[PDB]
Structure formats: structure tokens, C-alpha cells
Ligand SMILES: O=c1ccn([C@@H]2O[C@H](COP(=O)(O)OP(=O)(O)O)[C@@H](O)[C@H]2O)c(=O)[nH]1
């Protein structure tokens with residue numbers, strides 16, 4: 338494919354490890370779409386060279402630069418450095434449809450059927466299920482929509498510096514219109530690091546297509562032992578082991 | 593015609609049913625208030641329940657004449673669940689909104705009776721399943737015997753009732769978005785209905801949502 342792509346984001350070498358694992362798992366399950374990562378100059382030169390081997394396009398985004406299209410918005414909203422960088426995913430008009438994926442996500446099965454949905458399709462947030470989690474969503478790249486989100490980010494800002502409030506406000510019809518824009522939760526399982534005794538966790542892998550390590554603790558923060566294959570994730574350790582198995586096999590030798 | 597149906601199996605949850613009954617009446621509900629009671633609640637508590645509610649309907653799954661007693665022998669962990677499922681047997685009403693006894697109504701929710709079966713709010717943690725604390729349903733003996741056979745053939749996760757209802761109404765997450773109640777109708781974590789999920793219930797105490805419960809309790813319930 339050339340008009341559709343998976344888009345991820347990393348602003349440093351830490352989240353770059355998650356993007357490399359996410360990109361690797363997308364290649365493991367054989368996606369016909371392209372793999373794009375939005376990187377910033379804070380990513381080291383050697384880490385960027387590793388991203389070029391796993392991803393088809395490494396697109397540099399520096400909102401701190403005066404010439405960047407979101408810099409004027411950043412001067413008025415300095416707390417949105419990462420958020421405004423992510424919003425650049427709507428400016429990739431060389432694709433007609435994209436799925437954004439957080440760098441702390443992991444693909445367990447082919448999800449190319451996500452391109453059957455329309456903008457904007459996303460999974461419910463596990464805490465407040467009336468809102469959608471912005472870690473995985475189907476969108477349509479548009480210069481116009483990009484400018485409206487920059488405008489909405491200026492007036493609204495963000496309590497935690499994230500983009501969940503801005504996207505939910507702009508796409509305010511998600512909660513009550515078209516059930517087809519409700520992605521199944523298995524396309525964005527963001528409860529693996531929050532809850533331990535969820536009923537769906539009685540199944541190995543929880544029948545998930547995509548798992549999302551939402552929270553303040555990320556997989557690259559754990560200490561791994563490849564000899565034993567071990568490290569609320571203590572009760573369902575398959576997702577931590579899967580992340581580290583792919584990292585040590587696919588990503589670590591490239592470092 | 594239409595009624596709000598709650599459930600209590602002991603004198604503890606009846607205190608929450610009385611608080612739920614006051615909140616519905618305080619916010620001017622034009623419907624009947626029904627409560628499913630078991631022989632395990634004291635006669636003093638049933639008499640108090642008979643003043644607040646318009647119908648106190650007795651359910652006893654230990655009675656052999658009850659249709660769910662045989663299923664209880666196979667699944668002794670579904671005592672409360674099988675009693676809760678008796679809400680579908682109240683065929684005298686055409687449409688009912690079942691509410692947990694640990695819920696509290698902060699605004700009129702009579703517009704809930706605009707939905708069909710089965711309409712519920714998504715469940716925190718796993719939002720592709722609905723929370724079984726608040727849901728609109730149509731009473732029917734056909735659906736009752738259907739849920740009875742499903743509970744007998746499968747059971748439920750940790751003896752709850754959400755697993756059975758989500759397995760039966762398996763098309764809730766992907767079919768009709770009008771059957772997805774807004775999360776404010778079952779906030780279990782402004783709001784219209786708050787739900788005190790967890791092991792510790794409001795009556796187990798001695799932040800603003802809990803102070804509203806104890807205000808409604810000591811004012812409209814405790815003098816009885
Ligand atoms: O310092 C940061 C924080 C976030 N991100 C990117 O923005 C996303 C924000 O999601 P995160 O997992 O950090 O937040 P959570 O999902 O826990 O809310 C990450 O996945 C990355 O793609 C980044 O590159 N650098």
C-alpha cells in the first residue's frame with residue numbers, strides 16, 4: 338500500500354524503543370500498509386538510523402523551530418510540545434487514511450481491517466468510557482483539519498498536557514453517533530497496566546489484537562532476564578514478555 | 593405501566609435501596625418504585641420498604657417452588673444473581689429500569705424509558721461490556737427462562753450477574769448505539785446517577801458523592 342500508513346510518534350530515545358517494538362510487531366503480522374514514525378530532533382542520530390530500518394518513513398517534526406507550522410500555536414500553548422507534535426499526523430496528505438498508534442502499543446494480530454473505518458474511529462477510554470482513548474484511532478489526513486485542531490488547542494489547552502480532551506471535543510459526536518466508529522476494545526486494550534482481575538484476563542492474551550501499556554510505567558522501565566523470560570502485570574505477564582521477546586529478538590541487536 | 597426496579601437481600605443493602613428510593617422521588621419520578629426482597633430482610637425492614645416503594649415483591653430462590661431453585665443447586669454461588677434475574681418476571685410492567693441498591697439518583701432520569709432492551713452504560717475497565725448496575729429491560733417470562741438456562745449451563749465470573757447478561761445480550765457493544773446509555777447514567781468510578789462499585793459501600797462508612805448519600809440517609813431514612 339502507498340495511500341495508507343500506520344503513524345506512530347516518539348520524542349526521545351525512550352519512547353523510540355516502544356516505536357521500534359510496535360513497528361516490528363506490525364511487520365510480524367504482515368501489514369500491507371506503510372509504517373511512519375514522527376520523530377523529533379531530541380531523538381539521537383543513532384536511534385533515528387535504527388528507526389529508518391524498521392519504518393518506511395521517518396518524518397522529522399520540530400515544533401520548537403520558528404518555521405514549523407505549529408510553532409505559533411506553541412508560543413501561546415507551551416504545555417503542548419508533545420501534543421502539537423502528534424497533531425502533525427493530520428498533515429501527512431501523501432496518505433488518504435491513517436491509523437495513529439501510541440508508541441506504548443503492541444500489535445498481537447493483523448489489524449489491516451481498521452482501514453475499513455472512517456474518521457474518526459477509536460476505542461473507549463477504560464476510565465471514562467464515554468470518551469475515546471487517543472492511543473489508537475483511524476483518521477483522514479487533512480491540512481484543514483490540522484489547522485482547526487491547532488486552533489482548538491489554543492483556546493482549550495490541556496489539563497495534563499495531552500490530546501485526549503482536544504480530539505474528543507473536536508470529534509464530539511463519537512459517543513452518541515455511529516456504533517461503527519466505536520472500535521472494539523481489543524484494538525486498544527489499555528487496561529493491562531491498571532487492573533489485575535478483569536474477567537477477560539482469564540484467557541491467555543485476553544483475545545486482544547492491540548494492547549496499550551497506558552500509565553506512568555512503560556515496558557522499557559522494567560528489568561528483563563532473557564534466560565528466564567520474566568521481569569498488576571504480574572497476574573497477566575504475557576504482554577510484558579511479548580514486548581521484551583520482540584525487543585530482544587528484533588530491536589536490541591540493532592543497537 | 594413502567595417502574596424502577598431495585599433489589600435487596602439483607603438489611604444492609606435495603607438502606608441503600610431506601611436512599612435510592614428517596615432520590616428517585618426527590619427528583620420527581622412519574623413511575624412506580626419496585627424493590628425485590630428476600631425472606632432474609634427483617635420484617636421491620638420490609639415494613640419500612642413498603643412505605644417508600646409502591647411494590648415490595650418477595651423472591652426466595654431457596655423455595656423449591658421457585659423456578660431458579662434447581663439452578664441454585666448446580667450453581668450455589670448465584671444466590672444474589674438468580675434473585676436479581678427475577679426482575680424479568682415482573683410482567684405487570686411493560687418496561688423497567690433496574691437499578692443497583694448501591695446507586696444514587698442526582699437528577700431526573702425518567703428519559704431512560706425512551707430506550708429498548710437492552711440499554712446500559714459501558715463498564716469501566718472493560719468498556720465493551722456494559723455495567724449491569726443500571727439497565728433498561730422488557731420484563732418477559734421467555735427471557736427469564738432463557739437467562740436461567742444460560743446461568744445453569746455456564747455460571748458467571750466470580751458469581752456475579754454481569755457476565756451472564758453480557759453473554760446473553762452479546763450484541764450490545766457493536767449493534768445499536770442508542771442502547772449505549774451515557775456514562776453519567778451510571779458513573780461508577782455533571783452526573784445523573786452515581787454508582788458505588790467496590791467492596792466498601794456507603795453504609796460501611798462511619799468525596800462529595802458519599803456526603804450526599806449520608807445526607808439523604810440520615811434525613812429521609814434514619815428516622816424509620
Ligand atoms: O515523552 C513523551 C511522551 C509521549 N510521547 C508520545 O506520545 C504518546 C503519549 O502516550 P503515553 O503512553 O505517553 O501516555 P498514556 O498512553 O499513558 O496516557 C506516546 O505513546 C508517544 O508516542 C513521546 O514521544 N514522548
Ligand SMILES: O=c1ccn([C@@H]2O[C@H](COP(=O)(O)OP(=O)(O)O)[C@@H](O)[C@H]2O)c(=O)[nH]1
Pocket residue numbers: 598599600601602605672676691692693694695725788789790791
Ligand atoms: O449481599 C448482597 C449483594 C448484592 N445485593 C443486590 O445486588 C446488587 C449487586 O451489586 P453490588 O453493589 O452488591 O455489587 P457491585 O455492583 O459493587 O459489583 C446490589 O446493588 C443489591 O441490589 C444484595 O441485595 N445483597
Ligand SMILES: [Mn+2]
Pocket residue numbers: 439440441442472549550551552
Ligand atoms: Mn500510550
Ligand SMILES: [Mn+2]
Pocket residue numbers: 692693694695725787788789
Ligand atoms: Mn452496585
